[PDB]
Design a protein around this nucleic acid. Structure first.
Ligand SMILES: [K+]
Ligand SMILES: [K+]
Ligand SMILES: [K+]
Ligand SMILES: [K+]
Ligand SMILES: [K+]
Ligand SMILES: [K+]
Ligand SMILES: [K+]
Ligand SMILES: [K+]
Ligand SMILES: [K+]
Ligand SMILES: [K+]
Ligand SMILES: [K+]
Ligand SMILES: [K+]
Ligand SMILES: [K+]
Ligand SMILES: [K+]
Ligand SMILES: [K+]
Ligand SMILES: [K+]
Ligand SMILES: [K+]
Ligand SMILES: [K+]
Ligand SMILES: [K+]
Ligand SMILES: [K+]
Ligand SMILES: [K+]
Ligand SMILES: [K+]
Ligand SMILES: [K+]
Ligand SMILES: [K+]
Ligand SMILES: [K+]
Ligand SMILES: [K+]
Ligand SMILES: [K+]
Ligand SMILES: [K+]
Ligand SMILES: [K+]
Ligand SMILES: [K+]
Ligand SMILES: [K+]
Ligand SMILES: [K+]
Ligand SMILES: [K+]
Ligand SMILES: [K+]
Ligand SMILES: [K+]
Ligand SMILES: [K+]
Ligand SMILES: [Mg+2]
Ligand SMILES: [Mg+2]
Ligand SMILES: [Mg+2]
Ligand SMILES: [Mg+2]
Ligand SMILES: [Mg+2]
Ligand SMILES: [Mg+2]
Ligand SMILES: [Mg+2]
Ligand SMILES: [Mg+2]
Ligand SMILES: [Mg+2]
Ligand SMILES: [Mg+2]
Ligand SMILES: [Mg+2]
Ligand SMILES: [Mg+2]
Ligand SMILES: [Mg+2]
Ligand SMILES: [Mg+2]
Ligand SMILES: [Mg+2]
Ligand SMILES: [Mg+2]
Ligand SMILES: [Mg+2]
Ligand SMILES: [Mg+2]
Ligand SMILES: [Mg+2]
Ligand SMILES: [Mg+2]
Ligand SMILES: [Mg+2]
Ligand SMILES: [Mg+2]
Ligand SMILES: [Mg+2]
Ligand SMILES: [Mg+2]
Ligand SMILES: [Mg+2]
Ligand SMILES: [Mg+2]
Ligand SMILES: [Mg+2]
Ligand SMILES: [Mg+2]
Ligand SMILES: [Mg+2]
Ligand SMILES: [Mg+2]
Ligand SMILES: [Mg+2]
Ligand SMILES: [Mg+2]
Ligand SMILES: [Mg+2]
Ligand SMILES: [Mg+2]
Ligand SMILES: [Mg+2]
Ligand SMILES: [Mg+2]
Ligand SMILES: [Mg+2]
Ligand SMILES: [Mg+2]
Ligand SMILES: [Mg+2]
Ligand SMILES: [Mg+2]
Ligand SMILES: [Mg+2]
Ligand SMILES: [Mg+2]
Ligand SMILES: [Mg+2]
Ligand SMILES: [Mg+2]
Ligand SMILES: [Mg+2]
Ligand SMILES: [Mg+2]
Ligand SMILES: [Mg+2]
Ligand SMILES: [Mg+2]
Ligand SMILES: [Mg+2]
Ligand SMILES: [Mg+2]
Ligand SMILES: [Mg+2]
Ligand SMILES: [Mg+2]
Ligand SMILES: [Mg+2]
Ligand SMILES: [Mg+2]
Ligand SMILES: [Mg+2]
Ligand SMILES: [Mg+2]
Ligand SMILES: [Mg+2]
Ligand SMILES: [Mg+2]
Ligand SMILES: [Mg+2]
Ligand SMILES: [Mg+2]
Ligand SMILES: [Mg+2]
Ligand SMILES: [Mg+2]
Ligand SMILES: [Mg+2]
Ligand SMILES: [Mg+2]
Ligand SMILES: [Mg+2]
Ligand SMILES: [Mg+2]
Ligand SMILES: [Mg+2]
Ligand SMILES: [Mg+2]
Ligand SMILES: [Mg+2]
Ligand SMILES: [Mg+2]
Ligand SMILES: [Mg+2]
Ligand SMILES: [Zn+2]
Lengths: 136, 38, 78
RNA sequence: CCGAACCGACUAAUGUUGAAAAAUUAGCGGAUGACUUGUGGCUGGGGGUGAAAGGCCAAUCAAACCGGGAGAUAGCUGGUUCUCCCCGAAAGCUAUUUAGGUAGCGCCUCGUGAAUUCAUCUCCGGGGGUAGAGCACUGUUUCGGCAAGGGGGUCAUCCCGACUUACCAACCCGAUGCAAACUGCGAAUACCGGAGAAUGUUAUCACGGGAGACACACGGCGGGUGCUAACGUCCGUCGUGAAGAGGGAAACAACCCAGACCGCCAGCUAAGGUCCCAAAGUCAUGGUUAAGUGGGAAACGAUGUGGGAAGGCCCAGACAGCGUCGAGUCGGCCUGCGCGGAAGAUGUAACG
RNA sequence: CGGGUAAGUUCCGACCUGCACGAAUGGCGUAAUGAUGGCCAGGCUGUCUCCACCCGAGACUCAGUGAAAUUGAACUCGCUGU
RNA sequence: UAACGGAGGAGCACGAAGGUUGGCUAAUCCUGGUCGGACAUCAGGAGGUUAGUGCAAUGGCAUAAGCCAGCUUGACUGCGAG
RNA sequence: AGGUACUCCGGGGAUAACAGGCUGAUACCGCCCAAGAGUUCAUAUCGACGGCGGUGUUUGGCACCUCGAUGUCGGCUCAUCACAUCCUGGGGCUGAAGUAGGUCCCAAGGGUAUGGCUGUUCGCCAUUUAAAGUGGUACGCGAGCUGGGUUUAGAACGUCGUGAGACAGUUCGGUCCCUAUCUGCCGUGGGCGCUGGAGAACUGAGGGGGGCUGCUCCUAGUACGAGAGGACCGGAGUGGACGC
């Protein structure tokens, strides 16, 4: 479960999630799993998809995770009223915009990369698509 | 019969067929593979 | 529970009071600032809290000058 | 001690606009005693009396009743009576033993006075650090390279050290992201100032008479909070309701169209509509859908069906069927409309 | 834990881990007494299984007398929605 | 420009830590050097403010507002266009 | 500086407790992916790490309705609907030999315990049953009954407090009103209509009631099975509960 080792501040404004992604090319491997939709990826989701990916290729090749969950999310406990300060940090997310390459793979055939990425996408709350490296 | 939202070919002998507006999987080899979408 | 925050200070109404081209009388405050984001040019003084004020009547003029590309405010006699 | 009179009042039913403002009926306790009863007397209201329940003191008791101070006070609730004409708010800021009160200011009205005073647009002069972007800085982040060093070991071991890494690797170099409290960049708008025309019943400013108001609501946009929950909550800004009728959205303050001086059995339009209820096209032309989809919903599933650009194989005979057979075949991509996924309580009931 | 019951969050007897008993704002016992609180049994039964019939007083009809609370105005239906 | 929104501080200090004149320039690391070590003082180099600021944070600061020294009391009184 | 449950007045649904509403985090019920378990075998049956919905049933959030009053928990009486089905009916798959099960689909016609304890709802226990369903209806039902519990005034214990007093701690005691106008519902008449009047017998648009099930025997100790055991389908009899 990824999570910043330390941060300047404990809590963060909700913010919004507009725009298209930066980092839309396969930059490290040969195959990538790219986001088509918009949303949040929790650290548990990122890790559940990593495990499914890694078991499918029998821990061969190499896998990059291009996203990191650096945004803390707070929640108010059950049976607590409104007010009395911001809630407690409960988990961490990465904000995803369309076009974001989420994972990359190398050192395996394309057919196996497609199958491994399919099993991973089934763990994620956002629609995705399989991409390959381009020369330009 | 398996009643699922996701019905698929489970072996090379499974066949997809649509009967009266319902997607079904019928298999000549394995009765366990019979499915209907629902 | 309760919060350990909840404090703030009153707003200080800093900023530019007379913009470029405005005609001012001597003594008029042109900008209030913490430290010298703007520097005093011709016919402008710098107060003890770094307020820039007109030392003559005329028109406000902003310009970037010098080796550090610093911003200066001067008064053009009109 | 048992049990009538007499004195009580434990249980039940009735009664509850009663026969009764505490009873009746059937049962119940005491019944020679700290008993019960007649007549008369005494104790007086912060006072009496009390085998003590704040009990009782004339159907009244945590301070009786009557009269007076007296029209106590009531920042609270209610109510406030004839007509027409003109204008027309606010539900904010600051302070408050203040928060549903009040005061000054803002906003309304009436009056007087004074400047091309004010607004819109165009052009000119300005500051900016938001959106976006970026990663030198502050932090955070992944991969590779280099590697001080560190650790784990093989010897050596007095001091040395010699090697080796499951190794960890900072620094630096290259590549990838992230930030409300990061910025070597940086808009649109908004705002301040100047100039110019046209338009506007001075729309601006000052002073003076009179206020009301200081519970706001929903909708759009930018946000904090909450669960990017709430017809939730807290700001900014615009609109409407409030204080605004008419037409539309079946019905529906706050949405869409639009601002009702009065009369008309005239005409043109807006939003929204034109088969019948119900005013107006059963209009014209070309397509799509077969689900009553239209007229409720997701991940995901599928030879539904329309369109498009490529590709593989194929009369040197493909694909399916069983060497035969003789004309197409296969599966990706993108895209339009549909299908499953789809269970709720009075009655169809998710096109009025 | 034991007893009682086919079955017992109550009851009785114990144990002591007394949240938070305890010695005249008394401790522990106690015959007798109590319209006092809890539990068990015999008798008894319309309490109940499960109600039936009957006798009276009302209710109902006729004659006489004759109230009440309440009440913006009513030509005062169901459903589903708003 | 609000919230029982997110984070930190103050209720002082200083007759010099104030005035002025003259002068000066940081952190960190590397190399060599008695005791001396990761880190003392010395020398050179790299570096270029990554330091400093009486105390939070922000905006500033090299002409320094940072560091050192001499002389000093302008930490003056009355006023004040704007 | 405190207490008031001995209490009192003026106000507020500007503001809480009940029920409604909005919401759906939580809860419950579906589904998607398939790590694995299952000798082998992901999918008979379970389904880790994660993903997507539905309901409005839980615990909550909000404070929109009611503070010139919308009576509470449980029991009793009487119900009515939904279906996510407890029984009975129909079916697919099974790691289904049979008997008996597991799981999923269809199905709401009818049916769906009595007792001991406790105020209980619940729960545990005893003994039944084909079964002893899950929810909605102001957590259905007090102008229908009860009043054991909660929640006035009396009293006591433990505990807290100097004290008055206090405690979703405990303990004993403690007033439940209403003659029905309207809607609704169960019954029962009067009026007029239906086209001359009258006495009868009808047709049947439409509406309502009813719809449960055990055990034994035969088939047959047959099919099935190594045995143990033991059927489908079909037929006969006799009961329980309910109704006339
Ligand atoms: K006497
Ligand atoms: K007294
Ligand atoms: K009297
Ligand atoms: K008195
Ligand atoms: K005021
Ligand atoms: K005025
Ligand atoms: K003009
Ligand atoms: K401008
Ligand atoms: K950076
Ligand atoms: K707004
Ligand atoms: K208006
Ligand atoms: K339809
Ligand atoms: K005493
Ligand atoms: K004694
Ligand atoms: K007694
Ligand atoms: K006794
Ligand atoms: K000095
Ligand atoms: K000096
Ligand atoms: K008091
Ligand atoms: K009391
Ligand atoms: K939901
Ligand atoms: K919902
Ligand atoms: K589902
Ligand atoms: K109320
Ligand atoms: K029910
Ligand atoms: K069944
Ligand atoms: K079955
Ligand atoms: K049924
Ligand atoms: K009981
Ligand atoms: K219980
Ligand atoms: K209720
Ligand atoms: K009652
Ligand atoms: K009740
Ligand atoms: K009622
Ligand atoms: K009525
Ligand atoms: K029927
Ligand atoms: Mg933003
Ligand atoms: Mg400030
Ligand atoms: Mg007495
Ligand atoms: Mg008597
Ligand atoms: Mg006696
Ligand atoms: Mg006696
Ligand atoms: Mg007196
Ligand atoms: Mg008392
Ligand atoms: Mg009296
Ligand atoms: Mg008094
Ligand atoms: Mg007086
Ligand atoms: Mg008076
Ligand atoms: Mg007007
Ligand atoms: Mg004060
Ligand atoms: Mg008030
Ligand atoms: Mg940005
Ligand atoms: Mg202008
Ligand atoms: Mg106020
Ligand atoms: Mg206000
Ligand atoms: Mg407001
Ligand atoms: Mg908004
Ligand atoms: Mg908001
Ligand atoms: Mg609101
Ligand atoms: Mg909202
Ligand atoms: Mg008003
Ligand atoms: Mg209107
Ligand atoms: Mg209208
Ligand atoms: Mg209308
Ligand atoms: Mg016309
Ligand atoms: Mg018409
Ligand atoms: Mg539809
Ligand atoms: Mg669909
Ligand atoms: Mg229905
Ligand atoms: Mg026991
Ligand atoms: Mg027992
Ligand atoms: Mg005992
Ligand atoms: Mg004691
Ligand atoms: Mg004691
Ligand atoms: Mg003693
Ligand atoms: Mg004592
Ligand atoms: Mg004592
Ligand atoms: Mg005693
Ligand atoms: Mg006695
Ligand atoms: Mg009569
Ligand atoms: Mg404001
Ligand atoms: Mg404000
Ligand atoms: Mg100097
Ligand atoms: Mg100095
Ligand atoms: Mg008491
Ligand atoms: Mg009162
Ligand atoms: Mg509520
Ligand atoms: Mg609720
Ligand atoms: Mg309210
Ligand atoms: Mg509100
Ligand atoms: Mg209500
Ligand atoms: Mg009323
Ligand atoms: Mg009522
Ligand atoms: Mg069903
Ligand atoms: Mg039916
Ligand atoms: Mg039938
Ligand atoms: Mg008994
Ligand atoms: Mg009992
Ligand atoms: Mg109820
Ligand atoms: Mg119920
Ligand atoms: Mg009732
Ligand atoms: Mg009654
Ligand atoms: Mg009681
Ligand atoms: Mg009593
Ligand atoms: Mg009653
Ligand atoms: Mg008749
Ligand atoms: Mg029927
Ligand atoms: Zn198959």
């Amino acid at each position: 479960m990824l999570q910043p080792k330390r941060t300047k501040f404990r809590k963060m404004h909700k913010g919004r999630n507009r725009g298209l992604a930066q980092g839309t090319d396969v930059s490290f491997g040969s195959f990538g799993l790219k986001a088509v939709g918009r949303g949040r990826l929790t650290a548990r989701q990122i890790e559940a998809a990593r495990r499914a990916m890694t078991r499918a290729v029998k821990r061969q090749g190499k896998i990059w995770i291009r996203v990191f969950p650096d945004k803390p999310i707070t929640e108010k406990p059950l049976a607590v009223r409104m007010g009395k300060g911001k809630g407690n940090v409960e988990y961490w997310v990465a904000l995803i915009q369309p076009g974001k390459v989420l994972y990359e793979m190398d050192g395996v055939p394309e057919e196996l990369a497609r199958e491994a990425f399919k099993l991973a996408a089934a763990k994620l709350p956002i629609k995705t698509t399989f991409v390959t490296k381009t020369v330009m | 019969m398996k009643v699922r939202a996701s019905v698929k070919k489970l072996c090379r002998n499974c066949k997809i067929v649509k009967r009266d507006g319902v997607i079904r999987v019928i298999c000549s080899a394995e009765p366990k593979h019979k499915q209907r979408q629902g | 529970g309760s919060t350990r925050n909840g404090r703030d200070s009153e707003a200080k109404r800093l900023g530019v009071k007379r913009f470029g081209g405005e005609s001012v009388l001597a003594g008029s405050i042109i900008v209030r600032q913490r430290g010298t984001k703007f520097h005093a040019g011709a016919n402008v003084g710098c107060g003890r809290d770094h307020t820039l004020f007109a030392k003559a009547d005329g028109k406000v003029k902003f310009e970037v000058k010098g080796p550090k590309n610093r911003k200066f405010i001067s008064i053009e006699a009109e």
